Every structure is written in structure tokens, then in C-alpha cells.
């Protein structure tokens, strides 16, 4: 269709406002392509010339599927701008056009539908919202509403999982909860799926799901997905690791029941491979993860022991990217807190000392707080064994000492008391 | 990161 | 407070 391409605004409002249906196609077409074009399109020259209503008025022409389509797309790509230039579609009437257009009988004109809605609901909660509001979810949900998903063509099926994963995403407020019970189902059911970007998003969406209040969390977790969770935590494809590690990761931060979910369903045996993984997101993540574990019970604790676990905290706190030390040394804060002074002592043994004390050179007042926390919680554990003083060697060796002394000197209030403290009743 | 909020077709 | 949720 070579005569549709590289049209100026102005051709293209010249065809749209003729009283020719075919060059009206013609036009929108135009329009679409400009709309397409690898590098920006212009959104804004074509919201000035006033043809999103046009554009939203073909969307209605069941008599033309081209111009639906194209129009569609032309939306689509509109919406797929600012929050302005969205806000634009929206203020257009296009949200119960396209979703009139989800039953349509031509695939890639529904499929066009979901994605521009999904385009409409990622811009944030008040859109998402309105979305649902216009009656999407049915449509959508009755498109998967088939016997076997892999005889979905793999383009559709990853565009409904997306535009799906939209829907459940952003927090202020959270999507209405029996929007999302009504989609959890079928949420389920895609994190089962083959395909890679299918898992990937479903997982996405599962995270979007478990982040927030634990009321929240429980409506996931009582679908029973965490085990599937787990497994898809030890996939190949990091696309998938990632989002499945968040989904276990903002579960953990529930009830000690909901972590005892992940941890039954065997997620603790993935972590040697977690904590030491190339990526230092999945890296700073997993022990994110592990210290909302070892904010746990200490049966939970132990579970974190008895996996060998400690000793990739102590790998961890001693070489690693600097936020994931960070998110070590809560980990670790968080063990002492908690633990029974036997855990207490398996953790010393490990050599969590060293590591520790190094960690007290850093410029960060919070993680200082953090560490010489810990430090507090280990000698009091050791003075319920008259063992103070072995400790307080330990930490002059390495030259803890030499670093608590220092920081006793501090700016920050809760810093150098908590040094003193220490210094006056341990050195 | 993240799946895209938006995604624009291309070409 | 000990489990700190997406405040990571």
C-alpha cells in the first residue's frame, strides 16, 4: 500500500474529512503508518488536527474492519505516549469502543483492541480503573476462555497476559479486589503456560498482586501458586527468574504463615544459586528476600540454617554490590533479633564478624545503625554465656574495635550512643 | 526491569 | 516492622 506512506498531517486530514469511506481508509492508514515509524511519530501534530474523534468514530464502523483496525492501531499508538497524549484517547470515548471491539471475529482487530487497552490501563490506577469500570475484564477473560491455550497464535496470547498484567498493576490505590479475584483464575492458568514472555508477565502480575497489604498477599498465595512460583524461580531465562524472585520475594514480607508457604514449597534450596547469581539485582533481591526470612520464627530460622544458608549471607556481606550488603546486614540484624543464642552462635562460627565490621567503613548512617545493632544483639547473646570477652578479642583482631571507637565519635545521635553503649560495656 | 507500561507498535 | 515489604 506504498500510497499511504510518508503522508503530511495535513493530506491526511484533507482524506479523513472527505465524505469518501475508501479515502478515509486511506487517510487513517497514512495516519497509522506515520504513527509507526521507528523513530517518533507524531503524536502531538495528529491529537492539534483534531482526529482522535474521527479515529474513535471508525472504531464503531463494523461495515469496514480495515478502518477499524487501522484506526485502532492509530489509537494505539496515541495512547502509547504521554499521560497527556493518553488522556487524549480517553477523553475521546475510545475505551468502550475498543472494547466493544474485543468480540470481534477478526483476530488481529480484537487483538489491536487489547493492546490499546492495555496501553490505556498502564498509565496508572484512576485509567486501570476506568477500564474495568467500562466492563473490560469480561471480554478479555472470555478471549482465553479456551480448552488448550497453545492453540492461541503466541503474538495474541502474550498481548492478553500483558494487557491482563496492566490491570492488576499500581498501587494507589490497588486494583479493586474482585477485579482481581475475577482475573487471579486465569492468572493462574497463563503462569502454566510454554511460553517464556507468558511466564515472565504472568509472573509480573502475580508480583504486582503480592505487593502490598498482606490481605492482599492472601488472596494469591490462597490460590495455591507458590509452588509453581518456586519452580519458576529456578528457570534458565532470567526474564523469568526475576519477576517469580519479586512475587516470592513481597510474599515473604507477610504473615510467618505466608512464609512458610515459599519455604514448604521448597524455595529455600534455590538461594545457594540466588546469592551467588551474575546479576546483582537477582543477587540484591534474593537477599532482600532472605532477610524478611530471617525476620521469621525461629523454626524458620532454622530452616534458613539447615539449608547452609548462612554462610552465603557471610559471602554475601564480604563481597558484593554495596546495596546488596546492605540488604545482608538487615538479613543478618534481623537473625540476631530473632534467633535463640545456639543460631546466635552458629552465625559467629560461620564468621559473620569480620565481614560485619568491614561493613562499618561505609558512608551510610542507616546500615551503620543496622550493623551495630547486630553487633548488640551477638555480645548479648554471648553474656547469656559468659562468653563476652571471647568476643570482644574476635572483634579487636579484625579490628572492630578500632571502628566502633571511631564511629563512638559520630555525628548522628543514634550512631555514637549506640557506639558508646558499647564501648562502656563491652570494651 | 519491568514489562512496559506502554508499548507503541512499530512499523 | 522487622519484615520491611517493598521498602527495599
Known sequence: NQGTVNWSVEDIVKGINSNNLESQLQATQAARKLLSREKQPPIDNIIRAGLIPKFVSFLGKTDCSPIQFESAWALTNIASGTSEQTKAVVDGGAIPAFISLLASPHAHISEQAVWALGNIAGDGSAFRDLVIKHGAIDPLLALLAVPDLSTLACGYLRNLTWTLSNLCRNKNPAPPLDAVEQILPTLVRLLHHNDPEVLADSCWAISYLTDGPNERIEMVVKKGVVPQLVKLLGATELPIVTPALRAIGNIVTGTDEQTQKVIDAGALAVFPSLLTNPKTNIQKEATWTMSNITAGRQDQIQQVVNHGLVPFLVGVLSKADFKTQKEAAWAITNYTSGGTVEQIVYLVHCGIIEPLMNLLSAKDTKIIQVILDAISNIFQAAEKLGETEKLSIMIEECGGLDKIEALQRHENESVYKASLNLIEKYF | ?11
Not at chain 2, 526491569?1 to 512499523?11: D, G, L, S
Request: aromatic share 0%.
Open chain 2, 1 to 11: 526491569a519491568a514489562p512496559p507500561k506502554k508499548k507503541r507498535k512499530v512499523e
